[PDB]
Structure formats: C-alpha cells, structure tokens
Amino acid sequence: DSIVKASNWRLVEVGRVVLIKKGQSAGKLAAIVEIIDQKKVLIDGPKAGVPRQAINLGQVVLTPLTFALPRGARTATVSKKWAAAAVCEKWAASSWAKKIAQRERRAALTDFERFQVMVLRKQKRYTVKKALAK
Amino acid sequence: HFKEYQVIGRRLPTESVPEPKLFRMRIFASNEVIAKSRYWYFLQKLHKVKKASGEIVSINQINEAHPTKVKNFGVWVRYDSRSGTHNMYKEIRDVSRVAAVETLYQDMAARHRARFRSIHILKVAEIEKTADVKRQYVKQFLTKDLKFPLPHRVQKSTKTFSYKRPSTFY
Amino acid sequence: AESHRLYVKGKHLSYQRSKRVNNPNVSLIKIEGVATPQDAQFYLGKRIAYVYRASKEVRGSKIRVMWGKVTRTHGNSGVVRATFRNNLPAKTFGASVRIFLYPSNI
Amino acid sequence: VEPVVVIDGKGHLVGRLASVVAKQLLNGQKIVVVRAEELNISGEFFRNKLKYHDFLRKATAFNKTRGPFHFRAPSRIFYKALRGMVSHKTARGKAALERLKVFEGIPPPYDKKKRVVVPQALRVLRLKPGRKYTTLGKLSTSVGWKYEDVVAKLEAKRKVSSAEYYAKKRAFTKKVASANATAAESDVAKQLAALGY
Amino acid sequence: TKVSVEGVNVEKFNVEYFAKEEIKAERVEDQKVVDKALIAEIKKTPLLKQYLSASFSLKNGDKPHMLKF
RNA sequence: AGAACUGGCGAUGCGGGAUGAACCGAACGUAGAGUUAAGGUGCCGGAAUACACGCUCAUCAGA
RNA sequence: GCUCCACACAGAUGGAUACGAAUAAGGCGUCCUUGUGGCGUCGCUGAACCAUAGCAGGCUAGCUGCUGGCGAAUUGCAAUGCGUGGGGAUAA
DSSP, X not given: OOOOOOOOOOEEOTTEEEEEOSSSSOSOEEEEEEEOXXXXXXXXXXXXXXXXXXXXXXXXXXXXXXOOOOXXXXXXXXXXXXXXXXXXXXXXXXXXXXXXXXXXXXHTOOHHHHHHHHHHHHHHHHHHHHHSOX | OOEEEEEEEOOOOOTTOOSOXXXXXXXXXXXXXXXXXXHHHHHHHHSSOOTTTOOEXXXXXXXXXXXXXXXEEEEEEEEOOSSOOEEEEEEEEESSHHHHXXXXXHHHHHHHOOOTTTEXXXXXXXXXXXXXXXXXXXXXXXXXXXXXXXXXXXXXXXXXXXXXXXXXXX | OOOOOOEXXXXXXXXXXXXXXXXXXXXXXXXXXXXXXXXXXXXXXXXXXXXEEOSSOSSSOSEXXXXXXXXXXXXXXXXXXXXXXSOOOSTTTTEEEEEEOOSOOO | OOSOOOEEOSSBOHHHHHHHHHHHHHTSOOOOXXXXXXXXXXXXXXXXXXXXXXXXXXXXXXXGGGSOOOOOSHHHHHHHHHHTSSOBTBHHHHHTGGGOOOOSSOOTTTTTSOOOBOTTSBGGGTSOSSOOBOOSHHHHHHTSOSOHHHHHHHHHHHHHHHHHHHHHHHHXXXXXXXXXXXXXXXXXXXXXXXXXX | OOOOOTTOOOTTOOXXXXXXOOOOHHHHHHHHHHHHHHHHHHTTSTTHHHHHHSOOXXXXXXXXXXXXX
C-alpha cells in the first residue's frame, strides 16, 4: 500500500475565510473574493463590517475554514453564501476563536474580578490535588 | 501614493485668435502642483509652447469608477534611459487605474532604474475580454478555481526571545 | 506574600547622546513589557527610584535612593527619557530602576 | 524577566544571534549560549572556510605568537563574532563579556534547565528556503577544533538521559490533563471559565 | 468596584478634625461608629471583605499600561 | 596649458561624512524647554531586526 | 593548616517555567493491522503555565480547602524602609 502523507496546508482560494492582524479592521473576518497576484488578495466581510479592498497577505492570516463562492463575487452575493454556510458558528465553535475570546476576556477583568479568579483557583487546586496521589 | 488629474490648456487667447484648441490629457501625480508641472513638460514635447504663454483652464480629479472590481490594465509607456528613449507595453492585474500606475512606477524603478521624471504614461486601457492578455504572468491567475498555498510564513515576533522554536506551517 | 511590588521594573540604558556627545542630565530607561511609544505614554510623569546598597550606614539603613521623573518617550521601542535630581552615576548603565505608579492619571 | 536566559544556538546565525546577545549584555542581561557547535552561518561551506583562513593567515610578523590568536573551538569562533560588538575594552564592556558563557553542546548545570531561542535569528526564519548555509560544526572541524566527535557522542548521551525523562513527565501531564478534564465541568469551574480560566 | 456609602455619616469631620497642636478615645469612637455602618454593606457582595483585607501588588506579567482597575 | 568671472579657505569654531585643507549642513554671549537640518535607526551607536512592492548567490557578492 | 590571647565587620526583590528532530512539516491523544499505519485533535505567540489573601504578612478557636475570634492608628497628605599581631604545637 502506498502511504504518501501529508503536507497539509491552508490554501489561498476564492472563498477562503481570513483573520486580519494589522489594519483598521484588526481581528475581523473576511473572505478572499479574488486573487490579484502572488502577494495580494481582494477581500470582503459584509457581516463583520470590513470594507472591500486590495490587501497584502502579510497583513492577514488564513483560517482552516472555507465555503463555496464564485470568482469575483460581489458584497451581496458574499453575504448570501456567508449566511448559508454559517461560518460564524463554525468560527466560534473552534478552539482558535475561543483563545482570542479568552485573551479579550482576561484583558478586561476588574481588579476585584481578578481577586475572584485567585480565590476560585485555590479551590479548584484543592479538588484536583485530592484526585491525584490515589 | 498617486492620484489621477484631468488638465486642460489653451495658450492664452490673443487678438484675432479667439478660444484655441484646448489640449486634453490625463496626468498621474501625487498632488495638484506636480500634475500642473508635468503637464507643461508634456506640452513642450508635443509642440512649441512655454509656461508663460499658456494657462491651466481646469484641473480636476478623476476617481476610479468601480474600486471593488478586479481589472486587467494594459498600459503603454514611453521612457528615457542611458541610451535613447523607447516605447513599451506592460500588463497589470489590479483594482483601480491609480493602483495600477503606482505598481508600474515601482516595477519600472526595479527593472529599468527609471524615475518619475524619466517616465511618460502614454495610455492606460482596460482589457475586457480574455485572450487579449498578451503576457503570461497576468494570464497565470485567469485559470478556473486557482487554489494555492503561501508556505513558509515569516511570523513577526514583537519580543526578542521566543520559547517555542517557531514552526512555520500555514 | 511574595510580591510587595508596587513598581514596574526597568533597566537604565544610557544617557541621551549623539555619536560623540552625551548629555548626562537625561537618562534613557527601558521599561519591562513596553513595546511602543503609545504604551509608554502611560508612564509619563511617574516617579522613578534607583535603589542601591552603600558601604556606610546613613540613617539606620545601608541603602540609599535617587529619585526622579519620566519626562517623555524616546524612539519607537518604548525607551523613555528620564531626569533625576542628581544624575545617575553612569556606572549604572544596565542597572535596575524602579518606576512607580504615582502620580496616577488613573 | 529571568536572571539567566540560556539560549540554544542550534539553528541560528552567528551575526544576528550575536548582535542581539550583545545588546542584551550591555543592558545587564546575563546570558549563556549553548550547543554552540550546532550554530549556523550563511553561504556555502567553502565560503566560511575562506572568509576564515584569511582570518588565519593573519598572524603578526616578527612574532606570530603575539598576534591575532585564531581560536578554533566554535564557542570561541562565535564568542569573537560577539566581542566584536562590545567596546570590549572600556570597563563598560569587560563588564559585559563578563556576563557571557558560550558552551559547545549543553553541559551542566544547564542541561537540566529550560532554554530558548532568538526568533529574530533562525536559519528557518531569515534564510530564503533552500539556500546554502554553513553549520559551524564542520567549519570548526575543517580548521582545527579536535572534539566535534566527543561532544557529538558525549552528546547523544545527553539526549537520551533526557528523552527518557520527558516520557516520565509527558506521562505525568497525561494524568493532569485528565485530573482537570474530569474535575472539569463541575461548578467552581464553570465560574472561572466565565471570567476566563 | 463601588460600594454603598449613603448610610455613613461623614459630615462630622473636616480639615480642623486632623489637628495635633496615647491615641485619643474620641478618634476610636468615630472609627467604630462609621465602620459598623460600612461593614453592613461590605457583607452583601461575595469576597469583598477578603478583598479589602488583601494587599495589592504587581506580579510578573502585570503591565499597568494594559491593566484595567 | 593660458585668460577672464563668482565663491570656499584665509582672520572661523560647531553637527555630519569611520578618520581629513577643498564634501554636506550650519556663521558662536551664558542657560533652561521645545522643534529640526545634514546624516542616520542589526550591534559597537542615540534612533523602526519598521511597514510595502520587486530584483540580486557571487571560489574572497554587494553597500 | 590546628590552637592560645588582643582586637576588627557592573546591580537579588514571585518562579532559568529541562524532549529531540523537522519546517514543502510537526506536536499531543487514541486504536492497534506495530507501521514513513489509521482515526481524532492542536498551533495563528510566554497575553501562557505554576505560584499569588495574612504586622515585610501576627496572636488564638473549630470543621488562604471552609468557617471564626483579635491586634494594626500618632510613621500625622509623598521622601526604597567574615580579617588582623603576636605566641605554642607540627607539615613543608
């Protein structure tokens, strides 16, 4: 049997959902509408609020998720297939969006709320240390 | 960064010469003053005038029609060199007229060492129907369902010390 | 129990200088976890202390302190300009400097 | 942010690494580079072999014994690349270099202790894919250093003694992952998650 | 984090109260009367009593330009 | 090589060009604060191992 | 070095928090057909992890794991709070 594996990648494609690192959008999802060249893609996310623009692929990181979308699809057509595939649910269900949300949630804790975290982590420790050494 | 300007001039009307021919041309420049300056330089090449003899009638910006649609720009360019001047045609797949001429100036600097003063932009025109695309590297992206990866991603660390040994998958 | 720390700890890098001239009045301070001028804007006006052991006991303590202020940012890294009452000794280029949280904007 | 910052040359670039290690000293930041030998440069081998020998023909006239002492041992090969950016004369320097410790391989008492890497100096993060690039090791060997072997062997041994470790550990954190996985869900938990934890 | 304060009678003491010309009994009585009228509202919210007994410090990783107080 | 013309040094520090009669910036009471020039920001070296488009492998690249 | 007398006193501030190899690839978990095996899952920064409450951290009662009982001031509105100079004994 021929076992040639794997070289699994995130391909740039018409209908690839992306996450923007740098820019005014910053941490908001868009989809690759049409590839311009090696370095530039044309993106839009009508639900997130990110406008339609040419963007360098250094500005943006790709995500594991995709959906079927025609080449050079307009904002309204993007919105239709976006809602049909339901990629926001597919996004938030992942461990990845959960990590970003966790960083954001920890960033806006009150000093008293941080004290609460401390007290509860003492309690959780006691239950775990009980379960061990048995 | 650039902007497109519509400049018209008519060599100030004298006695028994009422309202001359009005030479119209589209200029790419960073600002309004540079656009005027470049306009006089082109008039003096096409015919015999001077800056004092003429007048800028109207200088207006031309915004691009659909800056949400990917186009194929076939640009004709004349440019000076170490040797005598010579015509050229290149092809750029881009969004706007302004972004197309921008990337052309960067490419002309890269491959030919020609600065802004050396370059004349003859005529920028779209290519609507495919198979008129004479260049290979523009035709390269025009295939059905182009799906390619961007492997070996350079991830910028803000800190100087990483603790993981970075694994550049994509 | 462990932490009694009410200060952000940052290293004393150098004096404000060119290639060939240094002004010893204005000291340059790297602060921990500060990457941009925008993050450093928070630390502007906060009191600084350089704390060190000395040989002779002065006031029932073998430890002396030089006090000062952050004045402004210095470049894109979050390195910060700082003027003390008595200038820092230049022997301290790469020594820990305690940046406090008073006076508070927040 | 850590009294000592043991670094691991393995897959770095003499110059960049160095440099960054330099700055870190002049700013009171003890350091300790390891696995020195398994360092990296740029450009074919035959290269670094020249851009060195030249550094070898050096030597002083009348008395070759008082001139540019050509150290073979990598650790050193690299230590130079560094003392080259550090006034290494004015006390401010001496004070530095005095803050360094480049070892070939990874001898105690570090072996047992975490290390790191300077993401801004990795062959795999600076050199355009498939492109010639030395490996000190050979380079040293080719020009003296008489131990590449010892470390070599005397190395693999270290990796063992450890690898074995990890297991024990990995096999340990396999429990925890469960301990919590189970002790998870409960209450006290839920709450935390809310706040983030 | 705010508490209820409207039950407390603060208006007795001002600038002149803190003159010095071993601890006076008048100062101790003003302490207890106020503090009992405050303790009652601290007991409402969970862990707030324990929060006030604790001491603030900046741990390794606490960047005050990021921290929301 | 010679002739004419206007500057620079001569009687002139200072920032920069690694270093300098001929380059670049800038004509100086003593200071404090702010902003810049010329030149630069891997480190020595104060300042972005900034961002973006391309190009270049050299057996002593190149700056 | 042992003994007897006399004297002298380049920058800590929660924790360096241990796999190796590869990067056009890798971890971690599971099933085993023990494999360059299958299934699942992770990365997109350490923004983590572990530690973290008490006079700069007390004194006492039970069931900082949980519940208690006391003390803090007046520090006054900031000023961090291990060699000598001689003996004796024995190795050189």
